[PDB]
Every structure is written in C-alpha cells, then in structure tokens.
Subunit: 95 residues, 4 copies
C-alpha cells in the first residue's frame, strides 16, 4: 500500500554537526529501504518554537491503567486507529 | 512489561450497548495480548476543552513522503528509540 | 511584534457563505489589532489523522482548581514566561 | 465567574530543591490572589514520561502567517475559543 505522509522530528540541540547529518541521512535511509518515497526535505536548523494548542473534545471518556508489553500496546494502538468509534487515544509510559 | 496509562474517547454518537461492547472489546485485546488491567475509569460523556503550552528547542526536520504503514511504523519505532530525537509527529490524510 | 504561524479548523458543517465570512472576520480582528498578515492558505476540507510522539522529563505538578478565566489567564501568562517551566496544560469541562 | 480546571505543569529538572518549593508555592499563590480555589495538589517528583497521541480531525483547514503583538493573539485567541465553528486552533511563535 501507499499513503502520503508528512513527518516532523526534532533532533536534540546537543548533537554535533557531523552526527546530525549521519542521523538525518540515516532516517531517510530508513524510509527508503522500505518502499517509502521522499518527495521533499526541509531543515530549519536549531529553533526554539513555542506552541500553544487549543481543542475541544466531546465523547465518552475512558481511562485505563495497564501493565503491558510493547506488543500489546500496538495491538491496542492499531485497532484504535481504524475504529471509527474511537476519536482520539493516548498513551503514557514511564521511562 | 511497563506501566502504561491509556486514554480514549468514544464518539458521543454511540449507544449504550455498542459502547458497552466496545469497552469490553478493547479490554480483551490487551489482556489476550498478555496485559494486566490495573484499573479502569469511565468518566462518561465529557466535553473537555484543553490548552497545551510548550516550548521545544532543537534541530527541526520536516519531510513529505509517500509510504505504507510498515515503513512508517518502523521509522516511528526507531525515532522513539533514538536518543537524540526529542519529538516527532506524523500526519496523513485519511 | 513577533512572527507567528496560526492554524485553525472550521467545522465541516459550515456553509460557503458562513465560512467565507468567518475567514474574513478572523482576518480583521488580527489586523484591527495591528497585525500584518504575511500569508494565507486555505487547504479546504481535510480529514487528517495525526500521531504525536514526545518525551518530557522533569518535576510534574498537578492541580485541581476552581477559578475564573483571569486567574487562569494570568497564571498561564506567568508559566509561559517562567524559565523553569517546560510545559503546562489546562483543561476545563465546558 | 468560576469554572473547575485541572492544570499540569512541568518544572525543568535542573532546578534546585529549595527553588522548586519557592516556584511551587509561588504559583499556588498566583492562583489564590485572584479568587481561584485549589482543591488538591499532587507532586510526582521528577519523571520521564513518554506520550504518544493520536487524533483525527476533519474540518476546513486554515493557515495564517502573521506578524503580531502579544495583544493581538489573545484577541484571536479569545474569540477562537468561544466560537462554536472553530474546533481547534494553534499558535507557533519563534523564541
Ligand atoms: Ca479511530
Ligand atoms: Ca526519542
Ligand atoms: Ca515556560
Ligand atoms: Ca471554539
């Protein structure tokens, strides 16, 4: 299959110029070896962006506390995303 | 195993039975996937308005791409893992 | 003055005229409040699914409170400003 | 007026124990001097939480690039929040 995605990621600012490129080229490499096709890349260099967000969500709210393995969450993950009855879902793990 | 907290929202539209089955259905998945459900809270139907305020500094990278889920999935995985990635987001049009 | 980028979503429900007025109405507010609109993009009606992935470390503080907006507003302001606050979120039920 | 709110904030982990309390007591102080009423506070101490979020939003999407003063954004801010036609709005500034 194939969908058009847009992706943003942030590299911590402590990383050294050469390392940077290595990681960067690395991730594009990661995308490519799997059939993905990169149409364009932008590098904004180091930035400090403040974001404020505001949303309103109405629905039947459910909260779960769970001990699980990585494998488990993806299953939950996967199935939540497809089901039209689930608007939004969120996961916090301790690290 | 890790501790996890999991939040999800159910369409305001859904009915009692459908709802009821759902919670059950999602409950099973976890557990049949070897997870223990420490605790559950049904907060019922809520309209919550929220405001997120955050500041993130670093090297910003943005890609437009054509990919399937696995390529994406994999990527996600490695970003999650990689130490020098603070954050990342992916969005597709349905 | 600062550079700002501003995103907003319009109910899928809204009609052409209502929509049209809206964009206009919000456009005016900024400008009558002395803002210059560098550029505008109408992406039309989109269904975008998104996934945010982030890790935040620090001292976590959580409060349940009864307050009006100004008390909140003020607080927000000072958190935004204070140097040792990485992030903060506020949620109310409508 | 008065509404019930819940608030979360994170203090950077570099801050020193005594400073901590000072800030903390400070912010409660901030809430109180303005009629707010704190019913409960929890301190989880220093934590590293990973969050993954997933939502789906359908609506007419609008993007603006703008040079504005603080004052301006709040006006935008305020009016967006109330209007039932605006589901979600977001603001990025450079800092
Ligand atoms: Ca879904
Ligand atoms: Ca990471
Ligand atoms: Ca701050
Ligand atoms: Ca609104």
């Amino acid at each position: 299959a194939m969908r058009k995605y847009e992706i943003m990621y942030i590299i911590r600012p402590g990383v050294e110029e050469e390392a940077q490129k290595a990681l960067v080229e690395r991730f594009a490499g990661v995308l490519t070896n799997n059939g993905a096709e990169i149409i364009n890349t932008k590098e904004w260099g180091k930035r400090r962006l403040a974001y404020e967000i505001n949303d309103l969500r109405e629905g039947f709210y459910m909260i779960l506390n769970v001990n699980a393995n990585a494998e488990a969450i993806n299953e939950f993950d996967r199935l939540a995303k497809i089901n039209e009855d689930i608007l939004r879902h969120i996961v916090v793990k301790e690290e």
